[PDB]
Design an enzyme around this catalytic site. Structure first.
Site: not given
Ligand SMILES: CC(=O)[C@H](NCc1c(COP(=O)(O)O)cnc(C)c1O)C(=O)O
Ligand SMILES: CC(=O)[C@H](NCc1c(COP(=O)(O)O)cnc(C)c1O)C(=O)O
Lengths: 401, 401
Positions: B188, B216, B247
């Site tokens: 990330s 992610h 996310k």
């Protein structure tokens, strides 16, 4: 080769079957209704829930649902970001300001749970030259937060001020720089409120900081529902207080740490869960702002809860059951054997009473129990009914004469 | 006495002052609108957000808000309970079943965040006789989960398969029982995709388990948005996959661990965050069920995201900037100096671009950067505006010629 991986998976399967045989396998019971006193389970039957952290009966309150909806309408569904990037809305700050004021602290910092607040506390404020003295009955989240900290660790038997003092002298003699005493405000598996006057007095004498996890106290313990620090009359003497929004304060999600401004700002700058985990959702933030107002005006709810707790304890006491703790909504019925605890719980469900058996590892082997939890929503009638059910089954299982 | 407590607070104040002097103090900017591309800040001005985990632009999507609302109308506001007591509703099971199927795994277990899924993973499955080999660039949540585990630890340079094999040999030769390789699917702070093919091939050669944190990647990486395991063509070879709902999948909160049935059930029985922390809120559970259907509906959002990423990287690279990583929505602009990162970010906001500076401790000292994140919601024009602003400011600051 896959010899070792095959073993990994086989032992898991074996260990699960073994847990089952020992009465240590937790089975989840599906609930189809919202959280409240009268819930419905998978087959559609109705039962009275006597084991939720829904202390003020607000988990399904119309006003909180309305606030959450209004919150999403104006502030969205999710922040999709940690606080320092783009996860801070005006409402997050409003909530933190409201929380700090409510607890009588300078500031407060939000986390997604109290488990995380505790986990991101110790390591951020103390190091190798320091020491942490913990009550041996501390929650798993405190223990894990302390495990991530480099400070020298010491433990004192539950509520034992003699041992606490012994450890404080020991830590200071060893040359510890900063010393911190960490304790649950209320020990959740026992229904025991900490002796904060005793703790704080010792903190003064030995120059130690005091940390209290009030997850099972905030909102309903104390005349103004402020928590154990109000209840023990040591308001202003506790340096750090952590808490949850997932218990009496709504029950959805969220946690926090309240302390002096320096502590809170440093936590924002270095607390790992705050830096590396999503900011609280807008719906929860909005509903939490509203719940604090409901709590501040919840004197009647606290009166009901307190009346319910004394009724259940008095009546179960009269019935001859072994009950841990005192003066709290948590009333654990001690049973010892895990198999008996599971059986007792299943039998109670047949009688319309929903409770859960507690056993290793949530509580020690040989100390299994059914941790009941009263709520402001319970009626005197439901409690009498629960007592009559416990008594009947307790007699049949040889738990009571 | 109070010398030590007084020193504790003074040092925190000194630490804070030293932090801002060195450009390491993170200031939070209040956002008054819902999370999206065009956000509103405290003074009422509008700026384009290029630093959110809102990869698919669903953080303020009406379908998720509607699903969240319906979820509360039927399942309440909060569970006010951990899963094994009275925190499991039919919807929690439905979401876990949907997640498992989506990810191509046997089952899934919900947590309030991926930070906690990782935190409650390792300690529960491995012990002192085992070993964990981690990619050096792993996220803090994996690191802290591993820190709570008694297994022997080994580290290998980011994406370094040579060193990974060296450590696997080392662990096995040392007599390790179970060996687990832990890695981010996508790192990330750098926008680097893990080499899972290389990892899994080595895992087979040394009989080791593989764990991937796809926070992610889940939802937008891979032709079907399944994650890095689909992208690297190793579906089924990763034993344990953790992820977040904070996310691309909505951005509110929540996390999970997906794996074989016996792994998941053991986690339910012994994972500390699962046993001692609140169950996921109904609103989020409901919205999450809906978001998986939205991710599956088609490749339109993913296509736009990847086109946007391609554009920004190409344009910024042609403009002369130093960028980290490759092929991902995360595009870090390397600046090195924290003071420069802070200044650059502030200057960009004056130009209508909202980005944040990244520096110690989120990234090493001397390695400050502005981590941009593209979103399916960004338009080609917004990206062009961004590139022009970055270029202009970059020249003014001397970051580029
Ligand atoms: C938002 C970031 O900057 C990014 N997010 C954190 C992260 C998690 C935690 O997800 P939860 O919000 O706790 O559900 C898990 N794994 C990874 C790899 C990351 O990055 C970040 O840390 O940079
Ligand atoms: C619900 C229980 O059985 C009770 N709750 C957990 C707990 C926390 C965690 O709060 P979050 O859900 O993470 O916000 C923090 N402190 C304490 C003292 C407790 O008990 C329990 O653990 O028995």
């Amino acid at each position: 080769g896959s010899h070792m991986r095959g073993e990994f998976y086989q032992q898991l399967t074996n260990d699960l079957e073994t847990a089952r045989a020992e009465g240590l396998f937790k089975e989840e019971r599906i609930i189809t209704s919202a959280q409240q006193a009268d819930i419905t389970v998978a087959d559609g039957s109705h039962v009275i829930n006597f084991c939720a952290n829904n202390y003020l009966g607000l988990a399904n309150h119309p006003d909180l649902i309305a606030a959450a909806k209004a919150g999403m309408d104006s502030h969205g569904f999710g922040m999709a970001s940690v606080r320092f990037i783009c996860g801070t809305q005006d409402s997050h700050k409003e909530l933190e300001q409201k929380l700090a004021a409510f607890l009588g602290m300078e500031d407060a910092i939000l986390y997604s749970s109290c488990f995380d607040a505790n986990g991101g506390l110790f390591e951020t404020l103390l190091g190798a030259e320091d020491a942490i003295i913990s009550d041996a009955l501390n929650h798993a989240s405190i223990i894990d937060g302390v495990r991530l900290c480099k400070a020298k660790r010491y433990r004192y038997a539950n509520n034992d001020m003699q041992e606490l003092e012994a450890r404080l002298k020991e830590a200071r003699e060893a040359g510890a720089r900063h010393v911190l005493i960490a304790t649950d405000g209320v020990f959740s598996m026992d229904g025991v409120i900490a002796n904060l006057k005793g703790v704080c007095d010792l903190a003064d004498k030995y120059d130690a900081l005091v940390m209290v996890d009030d997850s099972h106290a905030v909102g309903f313990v104390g005349e103004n529902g402020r928590g154990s620090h109000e209840y023990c009359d040591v308001m202003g003497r506790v340096d750090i207080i952590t808490g949850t929004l997932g218990k009496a304060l709504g029950g959805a999600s969220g946690g926090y740490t309240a302390a002096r401004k320096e502590v809170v700002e440093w936590l924002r700058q270095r607390s790992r869960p705050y830096l590396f985990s999503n900011s609280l959702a807008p719906a929860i933030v909005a509903a939490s702002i509203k719940v604090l107002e409901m709590v501040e005006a919840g004197s009647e709810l606290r009166d009901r809860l307190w009346a319910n707790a004394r009724q259940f304890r008095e009546q179960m006491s009269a019935a001859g059951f072994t009950l841990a703790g005192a003066d709290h909504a948590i009333i654990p019925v001690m049973l010892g054997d895990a198999v008996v605890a599971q059986k007792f719980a299943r039998e109670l469900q047949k009688e319309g009473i929903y409770v859960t058996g507690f056993f290793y590892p949530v509580v020690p082997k040989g100390q299994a129990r059914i941790r009941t939890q009263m709520s402001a929503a319970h009626t005197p009638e439901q409690i009498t009914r629960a007592v009559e059910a416990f008594t009947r089954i307790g007699k049949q299982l040889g738990v009571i004469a």
